[PDB]
Design a protein around this ligand. Structure first.
Ligand SMILES: NC(=O)c1ccc[n+]([C@@H]2O[C@H](COP(=O)([O-])OP(=O)(O)OC[C@H]3O[C@@H](n4cnc5c(N)ncnc54)[C@H](O)[C@@H]3O)[C@@H](O)[C@H]2O)c1
Ligand SMILES: NC(=O)c1ccc[n+]([C@@H]2O[C@H](COP(=O)([O-])OP(=O)(O)OC[C@H]3O[C@@H](n4cnc5c(N)ncnc54)[C@H](O)[C@@H]3O)[C@@H](O)[C@H]2O)c1
Ligand SMILES: O=c1nc[nH]c2c1ncn2[C@H]1C[C@H](O)[C@@H](COP(=O)(O)OP(=O)(O)OP(=O)(O)O)O1
Ligand SMILES: O=c1nc[nH]c2c1ncn2[C@H]1C[C@H](O)[C@@H](COP(=O)(O)OP(=O)(O)OP(=O)(O)O)O1
Ligand SMILES: O=c1nc[nH]c2c1ncn2[C@H]1C[C@H](O)[C@@H](COP(=O)(O)OP(=O)(O)OP(=O)(O)O)O1
Ligand SMILES: O=c1nc[nH]c2c1ncn2[C@H]1C[C@H](O)[C@@H](COP(=O)(O)OP(=O)(O)OP(=O)(O)O)O1
Lengths: 264, 184, 184, 264, 264, 264, 184, 184
């Protein structure tokens, strides 16, 4: 843990935000989402959740209706409603006041940039190979790794999609596999139930060992609010270290951790 | 139409077979003894029981819960009638509830049906009276203690016309009506 | 030791707090009202209720259950005592159970504890009698109806010395003996 | 369904057997397997489950006990016990008396070969490159796609192994990806909760389409026992055709589905 | 050398015919080929050569004219003229009489099959995935690895083409990267100034060593007419072995080597 | 040409230097290299160069002498001699005065850095992953794409090596494939006798087309000295320009082309 | 038009400069001394020499070979005149070829021109006589030994009107004609 | 030892066969007519000719060039003797070089040998005199015009003892010596 703080100081950490952060705001959850697909398609909330995971339940909706548009619209209009006030989420404040040079995310919403602007800051949004050409070394970069609501040919919201995007051949993958060469990543707001983070990291590691400079590989982290015995074991195999807490209020726990960074 | 039924009473299979003789539908009954929950509303109880039955079967299946509601006991059973009857039997029912000042009680069955897409709930009720003495055969639980409204014979002694005025017959008439008009 | 407690009763929290006061262990109690199941053996009931509590918390958490076992009623409640009390209160309890041939009954507390690896079951019991008249304060359920054996005072009327001979005290004495004996 | 029966005579169907076929024999199951690990680790059966998948609850055993030997020993001795009689399993009989030229499997045991010998047949086990060099076009080939108990450097029994094996670079992969070109596969015994089948076929199909001859890609199948609405649309996007039954006895179901092949 | 004849008998050798064989027939040759493009495009035979390799020279013609069609028409009508009699090429006779079950080739003509027919033999021509579905284990297989004159989108006659076909992702590569697992290849009629061989073999080798069963890798060969010191060294690391001769008549030398195989 | 100047203004040009630059200095040429290998082996200059390419005629050396050490030494000592004065090479002067943020190279020497320091400038050298971890956005980066003399597990000086480095899995590759997503490269000093320059761009370009934003991918360039009709077309296929000249004197030509960049 | 020229004679540069004064084209001459080939036909000789000059230059370049053909020597030089004149000079030419019974000889230049696409060949010839004595300046090889047809002065003493009737002037007139009409 | 030889003279094959009879080595001669170059030094000439012969063969091959050097012609032939003899023959040799004041001439052969690794050069020379009349058979070029030193018969009339004092015999004696001692 202390080692991590060592680096925020020098300038070698990358933030990878996930869906957990979007809780204080009050946005819908994944649950409500699938409830919707269910009502729409004619089923019942629970009966539906029995035939598949999620990147399957959603792919059904799409295969049936015809395309993803009809959903993107509900989500965009609903998640970005005018009843959510950013000024009241401490978590975002800290992220906007810290000093992380590069921020990656898997959310689809637009609150992380709204925050950076509200507390006075600058940024460049990168969702395509065209923006990679405007990057300025004097502003923060925000990369939408899983698409935004400003295109439907990208948003990764279904199996087939969460597939092709596993050979890492898109422009935005080639850019991340060259940004971690020499850098530690601090996952937050994430959940240990996705193998993208186990193919990126199980694969970054093997390289150092092939060169045999292992000792050099920078060190990752993954604050998880609740603690688990078994996972630490496996995630240590690929340099990733957990940093749990004791406060049972998950939200509070998260706000905390982000004070050791805002430190003026 | 082919619908499945999960229970633990073997005579429930017999009555649901002989009520549904000739309507067109058939039931493929299986014995599993799903454990119910302790709640006040029977809607959440029959939803939980139908959820466990659908998790066990995976096909169109209905389940049924049957409850007494004694007015002298402020409607204490119903949801929880099975442990009551299996504990105190017929001897310790008539001597302290049949001799009460208020012998009114209502019997209800709720039917939770799942068509593998949605959950449909059908119910029936019959007002009645508790006998002061067990009267009739004792092979089908509390039929020998229940006096229906308008008669003086218990449900056990009444015979095969038990399932013509019964609350199970009304609930299965609504169930048979929805099964014959279709998936509404 | 920092252990958590999930319950519905609020006065149970204060009883367990003043019983375990000064021991060294502390209890972070939370209110969720976990529904129980309708089974006869309290081991499976305390096992699945502790399973639901560990699914709620995920940290070391213990779970208590209390039941009255009426010898006149063939040992009916115990596991199902909550619905019994919540439908009858003290008015329709003593007039039909305290005036019978066998006022004897036994009250048991069973504690299910999870150390995030295993499930540990501790239990204690007191024998007692149902009073014919409810006696004492009426803020803690059946305390004003339960006289212990060898006493003429209901558990609400003895006051703070209830927590030296009650079944919660023996069950939490075995729990305290395990919690300071180590994680055996 | 009929289409399948068409080919079962041209010799273009490949059989891919999975655990469901076994069980019926009387063997254990991951239930017991995952429980064993638990007792052997101080945990309680249930509590252990609440922590990871199943593969994960085995990447762990090993890590603690250093290696996979201890476990492979229990499995081998327990499964291949001597209280199991093969002549009492019809499923294994019909399979032995059919006419499938190539047979792939993901089980670790040795019962399929045992049966083929019991009813008088000949075969060549293939679990390494050396064997590939002995193939006789006049005998059956039984390929172990997930390792046998006669080696521990090649037994997929943990996460980090269901990984380097998702890149299809092993010799035994190159073989499959040449056998499926020009033939169809009849999956049986399998439970669709594994994405190996969804990255193989998803990847074979997209190949025919580039070749502009999709209408030629041979047809596949997958006898499941109880049907699923959702997971039937998704599995067509790729190119597999589900089949199913009404008999609710699982074992009963599978047996008859096969007599449709044994005849003759 | 003797070792090769050992393998020929068991049935574990593959033949890879190249352009050298097409000399006895009296067909044209690259010289004349490139001379041709030159006259057409307006240059002079020699001045043209001064500008590029050979494939490059051809990719020019195409771009200028518009597409390959025009050339394919010349090559086809010219190379398959009616002044060539197959009965007078001993080399072909021997090839049609030996027992090789799989013959790969890089020529674009059609004489190898014409030979196999004239001396009574049967075959299956595989130039596409559709054919990989008719293979019969009772006839010889002839694979056109570099295209035929019956399609314009396969013929590999230019850089861009000799490129993509270097990642080995075509359907007809996967078949060859799985036919050499457990078999030896005998190159003939080839030249050592083309480096596809060096990426195929340099890559088959590394695989055995990973398994560390290298001692088993079957052994290749490459009859070259005139001996050369340096090359033998390099082509040994990759695991291939030369078998030169002394007759200075290259053609005559070749007819010879192929008699130790026809041996009734 | 004018287009190029545009980009140089903002900061979207990367420089890639080759051996042509290091000839004006006086260094040994490649001819002398191969010749040396010859004398040291009993052959005579001419006859030796009749058996293979050049890289090939250097893998032979090693193989015989067991290792590359004996050569790196002659080369290092001979090139970095003390009879060479850097302040007498304009080409190297200008390069040190321009404003190129990143500089890749395929030379093994150390003269570029030497110049950058002689004329007062700061820079960082990157020949391995550890260095990537030290990059400062306020100094120049000099990347050695083909190894330096300070390590022999990297130097690319033989066939086998110039091969495995054509799959781009090395850490230094991943970097170049993320640097060119958004910028243009001005090749200088090079000679069209490679396939690295061709499979690099041929592979980048195709990516932009899938992205459907071909009109955005930038333009490389390649100042050659004498002009070639053919190559201009073939190289036009992948956004590579060409900027020849008329002054025959090779050195004269290059220097001028550069003043167009220094311009104070 | 800008054409290049490769030679070893420095006075060939002077004559080709002063013949081509004012026609429009200019030559950028370089000295390399390409070694010719020993053949009978001058076409293969000038093709080989132009091939070496184009391999050295790589741009539009022409080359020129100049040959004497002595009838008493059965036309022995021509292709191979340079080694002949550089060996026996002017002293051992006139005393044994100028005194011969047949003093006829013809001088020819062939011009091989490459436009970087094709090879174009232009030639000229002038019949003449060998002098019995070297007469004129001796700065430009055998001009002091060659009597042209119709005159009695050698090419050296004749002056700047040497390149008005000469075979080099006819060959470069055809070369200048093809350069001015264009790439035919 | 097996060495190859490329030439255009068919009688060179005969003489090199009959000189090397019984020494152990054999030659496999082929006819190609490699075109030589025009230079002064025979070392670069025989290196270029052996380079073309090794590019054509690719095996251990030697080549040989034979040159006259007439002192009255200041050593004009040698390297370039073939075109000289093929043009002026035997008629126009003796009447203007055999009648000269200085009839001295030396005949040399150079042998360029390549062992497929290096280039080895062997040479021989014989001083002689030009006859004033062709004398002897005329089947092997200028043997009927060459008077060797110490005799009065030409090489043609001398017979099979021509290759015992000849410069070809000395050069092939050195070649045979190096072939028999080995690859030095
Ligand atoms: N018999 C068993 O119960 C058992 C269990 C484990 C291993 N195995 C071996 O594996 C097979 C059976 O496996 P199983 O079906 O029991 O597995 P499982 O039920 O343990 O799989 C858990 C779930 O994880 C999923 N998954 C895969 N990648 C995921 C990701 N990125 N995110 C989320 N979910 C992901 C699938 O949906 C799967 O349903 C057999 O072939 C056997 O050899 C046996
Ligand atoms: N420093 C130097 O002078 C020097 C020179 C040679 C090599 N190199 C290294 O190589 C690169 C520069 O090389 P270069 O441009 O001088 O030439 P090179 O030595 O790489 O040329 C290799 C030749 O092989 C040819 N070739 C490619 N594929 C072929 C095939 N299939 N069949 C036959 N020939 C084929 C190419 O066209 C080229 O002519 C840099 O990476 C450099 O480090 C350095
Ligand atoms: O027509 C009836 N006449 C007399 N007695 C009856 C009748 N029907 C049910 N009974 C008894 C048995 C049953 O156990 C209990 C309450 O019914 P009930 O609680 O729903 O049954 P249950 O708990 O055993 O499970 P299930 O409904 O799946 O059979 O009264
Ligand atoms: O010392 C006691 N003295 C008098 N009454 C008591 C006592 N202890 C429990 N009781 C009553 C209240 C309780 O509601 C019922 C059954 O206990 P019980 O159902 O487990 O309590 P609860 O439902 O409120 O909390 P929980 O969620 O932990 O089950 O008996
Ligand atoms: O107008 C001329 N008047 C008198 N003598 C001339 C003339 N022009 C050439 N000469 C001499 C020099 C030249 O070397 C030789 C034959 O010419 P020639 O053999 O083609 O010259 P060369 O072998 O030295 O090479 P190059 O033609 O590239 O200069 O007679
Ligand atoms: O023993 C000889 N006695 C008389 N005349 C000879 C002799 N040997 C060669 N000759 C003639 C032919 C030959 O062409 C020319 C000079 O020899 P030379 O210039 O080296 O022969 P060449 O140019 O035709 O080519 P090559 O040496 O490959 O045969 O004098």
């Amino acid at each position: 843990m202390e080692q991590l703080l060592a680096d925020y100081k020098k300038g070698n950490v990358i933030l990878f935000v996930g869906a957990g952060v979007s809780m204080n705001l009050g946005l819908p959850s994944w649950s409500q989402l699938v409830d919707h697909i269910a009502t729409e398609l004619g089923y019942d909330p629970d009966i539906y959740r029995t035939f598949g995971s999620a990147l399957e339940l959603a792919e059904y909706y799409k295969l049936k209706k015809g395309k993803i548009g009809p959903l993107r619209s509900w989500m965009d209009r609903m998640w970005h409603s005018s009843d959510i006030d950013i000024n009241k989420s401490k978590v975002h404040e800290y992220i906007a006041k810290a000093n992380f040079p590069i921020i990656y995310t898997t959310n689809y919403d637009r609150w992380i940039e709204t925050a950076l602007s509200n507390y006075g800051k600058e940024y460049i949004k990168i969702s395509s190979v065209s923006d990679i050409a405007k990057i300025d070394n004097n502003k923060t970069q925000i990369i939408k790794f899983a698409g935004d609501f400003d295109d439907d040919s990208s948003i990764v919201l279904d199996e087939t999609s969460y597939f092709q995007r596993l050979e890492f051949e898109t422009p935005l993958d080639i850019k991340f596999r060259s940004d971690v060469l020499g850098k530690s990543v601090l996952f937050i707001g994430y959940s240990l139930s996705d193998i993208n983070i186990r193919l990126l990291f199980y694969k970054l590691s093997k390289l150092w060992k092939e060169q045999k400079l292992e000792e050099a590989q920078p060190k990752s982290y993954i604050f998880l609010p609740r603690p688990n015995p078994i996972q630490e074991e496996i995630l240590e195999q690929w340099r990733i270290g957990m940093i749990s807490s004791e406060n049972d209020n998950p939200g509070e726990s998260l706000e905390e951790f982000l004070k050791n960074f805002v430190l003026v | 139409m082919n619908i499945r039924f999960i229970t633990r009473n073997r005579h429930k299979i017999k009555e649901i077979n002989k009520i549904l003789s000739g309507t067109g539908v058939v039931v493929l009954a299986s014995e599993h003894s799903i454990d119910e929950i302790q709640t006040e509303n029977v809607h959440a109880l029959i939803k939980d029981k139908l959820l466990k039955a659908f998790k066990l079967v995976g096909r169109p299946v209905f389940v049924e819960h049957t409850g007494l509601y004694i007015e002298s006991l402020n409607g204490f059973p119903g949801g929880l009638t099975q442990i009551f009857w299996d504990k105190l039997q017929a001897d310790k029912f008539s001597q302290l509830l049949g001799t009460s000042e208020n012998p009114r009680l209502v019997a209800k069955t709720i039917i939770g049906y799942c068509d593998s897409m949605k959950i449909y709930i059908f119910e029936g009720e019959t007002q009645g009276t508790i006998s002061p003495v067990p009267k009739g055969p004792r092979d089908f639980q509390w039929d020998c203690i229940f006096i229906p409204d308008g008669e003086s014979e218990t449900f056990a002694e009444m015979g095969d016309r038990k399932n013509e005025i019964s609350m199970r017959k009304k609930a299965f008439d609504k169930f048979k009506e929805y099964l014959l008009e279709g998936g509404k």
